[PDB]
Target: 458aa long hypothetical endo-1,4-beta-glucanase
Amino acid sequence: QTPTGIYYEVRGDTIYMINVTSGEETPIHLFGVNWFGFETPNHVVHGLWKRNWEDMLLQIKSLGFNAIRLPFCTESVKPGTQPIGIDYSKNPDLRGLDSLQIMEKIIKKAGDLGIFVLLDYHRIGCTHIEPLWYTEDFSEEDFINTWIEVAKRFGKYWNVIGADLKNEPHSVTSPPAAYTDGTGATWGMGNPATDWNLAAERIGKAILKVAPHWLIFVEGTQFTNPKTDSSYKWGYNAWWGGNLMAVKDYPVNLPKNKLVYSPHVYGPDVYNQPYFGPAKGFPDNLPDIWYHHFGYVKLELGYSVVIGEFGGKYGHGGDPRDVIWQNKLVDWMIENKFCDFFYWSWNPDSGDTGGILQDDWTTIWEDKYNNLKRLMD
Model:
């Protein structure tokens, strides 16, 4: 049932942490941040050229976060991969360590601070998010085996809550083509080699055989199938990882008490969506859009929904409607009790969203954080 003594499960739509010996159960909320870098050519979380890694985790904790989503790529989780872009004078305890050992040290320190860690297989290579969970040189079996290896190693850390199976399944062509051309993910189209709802079952089952105490976080696709996407006016304008419209008729066939649906949702800094125009009713039109793309998965179907990424520059060098967008999204999360999320990102070096930290890697954006701090309380 668990190698750590801790078992994570969904009851109703709320995540619980269960101590299996004592029987004790506590509902947890994830107030999270993404700290990226393990999925990149750096092979390490970013910012260690300016900061000490432990000081970073203390800063994250000081702001009330209790969860980190940790993106990784295949190479960072293999022994011997060398990280790039570390200041060793600021990080002397990291001299000699390869990418995997720094991942371990960061997870163990997070657990010491009571911070839960969600592992996110973000990229198969270390350059960009592939639309599918395999490539010409890296098969679905290779993807699964890598998850199995990750789950064997990191399932022994009590604070790791589970596996976000593949970051942002999406399409690289337009519909109606994208449904059949084999280049992108689908959901409910029928082909198990493209249908993320079938692939998530295959990958999730394998993980749960080796880490039965983990949760399985399953993101949306960008497009699903034509009947579902055509059923809603904004059905073709969901984000990568953000279309969960096919959950109702095509649910992932995994145990409900182990499954979390994890949509990504963004504002005008990422893409100038037509519904971000006032001409189309922004921002008061957003609760219905969110509700259709993903929110009904909790509010109508009662599954656990954790927002895996959301963020934006909040008016600092980007589109100033982002301020209105983030405020409205937090208002809606508070009203609808979506209390579990991971902000994108802690890092400032995200080109279309910036981060909680400013470009000095030290000072936070006070306004952007003050809005987020409303979800925390």
Notes: The first helix runs from residue 53 to 62. The domain at 1-377 is CATH 3.20.20.80 (TIM Barrel). The first strand starts at residue 6 and ends at 11. The CA atoms of residues 173 and 298 lie 30 Å apart.
